[PDB]
Amino acid sequence: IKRKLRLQLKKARFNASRSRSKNKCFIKRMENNRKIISKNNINVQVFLVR
RNA sequence: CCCUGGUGGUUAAAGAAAAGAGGAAACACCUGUUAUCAUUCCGAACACAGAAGUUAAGCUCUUAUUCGCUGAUGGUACUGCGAGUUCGCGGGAGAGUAGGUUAUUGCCAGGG
């Protein structure tokens, strides 16, 4: 099988193998962060997670 | 203060064309080349000497926006970033369209 195609295919399969549950957790976190940022003049605690 | 003439600032056509209104003052057209001046020839422009006449033109004002110029709100193109992917967040045209536009203003002189 040709190397160009198999590299494309392997990369596409890795990309597509993401879990919707994890995506939903990330979406929930993003929504929470945007809601907090929408505020103004409050003390906020920032954790680094990535 | 206002009209007119001259001189600045504020730059969005503060643009040209067509039609109408005036001209007291001011301005312009207009008179003569003969005096200094100018033209690669020509008082046309300019230069000089003056006021007989006029709104015709330039100019000012009023006009349909006829040409131009300017321009929405949305939408789209495009773009930053993202463990949401033809998506999530942020910014947002050009063009087109509803429209709008023939300025405004500081201070010198003449007199209404």
Side-chain angles (χ1 to χ4, degrees):
Chain A
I1 78 173
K2 303 197 174 318
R3 197 180 174 271
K4 195 189 176 186
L5 258 64
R6 70 169 281 267
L7 287 201
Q8 308 182 3
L9 214 50
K10 172 180 195 167
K11 189 183 290 183
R13 296 206 171 124
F14 195 77
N15 285 344
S17 89
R18 187 84 208 286
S19 296
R20 177 67 178 177
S21 76
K22 297 283 189 50
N23 275 359
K24 275 206 75 68
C25 292
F26 165 80
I27 289 180
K28 187 185 312 302
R29 182 161 62 84
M30 290 284 117
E31 300 183 35
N32 168 35
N33 277 5
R34 254 186 297 286
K35 186 174 70 37
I36 301 299
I37 300 168
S38 84
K39 281 189 175 46
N40 199 324
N41 303 327
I42 302 97
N43 272 260
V44 57
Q45 193 179 16
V46 190
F47 297 82
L48 187 69
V49 304
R50 286 211 56 187

